[PDB]
Amino acid sequence: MATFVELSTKAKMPIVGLGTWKSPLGKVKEAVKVAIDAGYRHIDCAYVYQNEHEVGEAIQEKIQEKAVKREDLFIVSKLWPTFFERPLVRKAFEKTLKDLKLSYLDVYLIHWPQGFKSGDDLFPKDDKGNAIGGKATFLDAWEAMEELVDEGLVKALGVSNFSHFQIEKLLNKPGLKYKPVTNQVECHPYLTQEKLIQYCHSKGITVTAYSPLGSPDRPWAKPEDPSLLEDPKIKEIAAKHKKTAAQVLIRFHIQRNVIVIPKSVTPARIVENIQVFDFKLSDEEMATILSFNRNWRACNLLQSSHLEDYPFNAEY
Ligand SMILES: NC(=O)c1ccc[n+]([C@@H]2O[C@H](COP(=O)([O-])OP(=O)(O)OC[C@H]3O[C@@H](n4cnc5c(N)ncnc54)[C@H](OP(=O)(O)O)[C@@H]3O)[C@@H](O)[C@H]2O)c1
Numbered sequence: 081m082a083t084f085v086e087l088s089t090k091a092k093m094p095i096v097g098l099g100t101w102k103s104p105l106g107k108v109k110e111a112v113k114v115a116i117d118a119g120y121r122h123i124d125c126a127y128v129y130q131n132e133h134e135v136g137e138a139i140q141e142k143i144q145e146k147a148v149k150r151e152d153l154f155i156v157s158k159l160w161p162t163f164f165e166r167p168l169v170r171k172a173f174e175k176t177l178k179d180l181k182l183s184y185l186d187v188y189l190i191h192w193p194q195g196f197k198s199g200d201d202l203f204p205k206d207d208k209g210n211a212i213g214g215k216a217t218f219l220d221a222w223e224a225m226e227e228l229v230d231e232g233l234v235k236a237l238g239v240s241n242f243s244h245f246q247i248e249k250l251l252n253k254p255g256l257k258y259k260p261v262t263n264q265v266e267c268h269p270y271l272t273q274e275k276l277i278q279y280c281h282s283k284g285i286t287v288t289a290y291s292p293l294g295s296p297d298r299p300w301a302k303p304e305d306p307s308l309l310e311d312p313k314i315k316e317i318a319a320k321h322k323k324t325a326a327q328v329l330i331r332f333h334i335q336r337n338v339i340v341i342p343k344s345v346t347p348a349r350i351v352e353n354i355q356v357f358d359f360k361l362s363d364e365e366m367a368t369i370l371s372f373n374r375n376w377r378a379c380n381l382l383q384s385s386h387l388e389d390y391p392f393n394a395e396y
């Protein structure tokens with residue numbers, strides 16, 4: 081039902097997907113069921129979201145009830161940076177694929193470029209709260225991930241929260257077998273990513289926009305923070321088209337050929353978020369929205385800003 085962005089592999093990635101970060105156990109299964117019924121085919125998942133098993137339950141049931149075929153679903157997951165060491169890449173992936181109850185993933189992403197210390201903690205810190213870096217790097221991780229593609233377990237690899245310098249480092253890696261098909265990064269009218277998007281597309285790499293609604297449910301939201309959903313200029317453009325702000329925020333990416341993955345566990349909103357192929361933002365409206373860029377990140381991960389491959393010190 082969503083249109084598709086063509087990947088460098090010629091696979092078709094549905095341009096709208098369901099986000100699952102912060103979707104609680106006990107709600108996410110129904111959210112995915114509702115989404116599939118509404119015509120979503122792309123679901124965005126991650127090991128670190130700690131809810132992939134419920135996502136897997138929903139997909140499995142919808143497939144068995146013949147609501148959807150596996151071939152028409154596009155499931156993305158991510159390798160968390162505590163798992164960059166070779167045996168850990170496979171073990172992390174295997175837990176993800178098992179939880180999701182799939183025989184293959186459509187895309188597996190490096191979740192963040194900066195490595196974290198391996199062990200039991202997802203967010204390893206020292207006695208000052210600073211992230212502890214790891215031994216293996218994302219280049220090491222990538223090599224282990226390429227094996228998954230060779231074995232038919234993953235159709236395509238991608239990256240997330242990478243700057244152009246880091247994509248360069250990957251594309252230049254000696255013996256590189258597979259190129260990233262997407263870079264999943266924060267993107268919305270307050271962080272328009274013009275240079276990064278330009279760079280990615282010029283390398284034949286798609287962009288997946290995360291937190292497109294401004295992630296209002298992120299734990300660290302402060303009342304004074306920018307709030308896209310409440311932005312009167314966005315709402316004004318919405319009103320013109322008799323749509324909601326969320327729908328304009330989602331449509332914005334579609335018109336830049338950028339994949340977008342709004343999260344909701346509210347059934348009415350899940351449905352609302354995909355009613356975005358029946359209107360069109362004018363050229364003037366796109367330019368106005370583009371002009372709202374504030375270089376504001378809802379997802380900064382400042383706790384890890386000291387690590388070698390922290391991505392957000394670069395200009396883009
Ligand atoms: N790669 C990464 O590092 C990374 C980082 C962040 C996010 N992501 C991915 O991107 C997805 C989306 O980003 P996000 O979860 O940060 O936030 P988001 O999708 O920008 O916003 C989610 C919030 O918006 C609300 N909402 C959804 N639809 C709405 C609507 N139509 N009207 C009003 N409110 C609405 C949701 O409430 P309800 O759910 O209560 O309806 C939820 O609180 C994530 O879930 C995750 O899959 C990836």
Ligand SMILES: O=C1NC(=O)[C@@]2(CCOc3ccc(F)cc32)N1
Pocket residue numbers: 101128129191379381
């Ligand atoms: O979808 C997300 N991927 C992430 O790395 C992030 C952004 C930064 O904050 C956190 C914290 C916990 C978590 F599970 C996830 C996250 N949200």
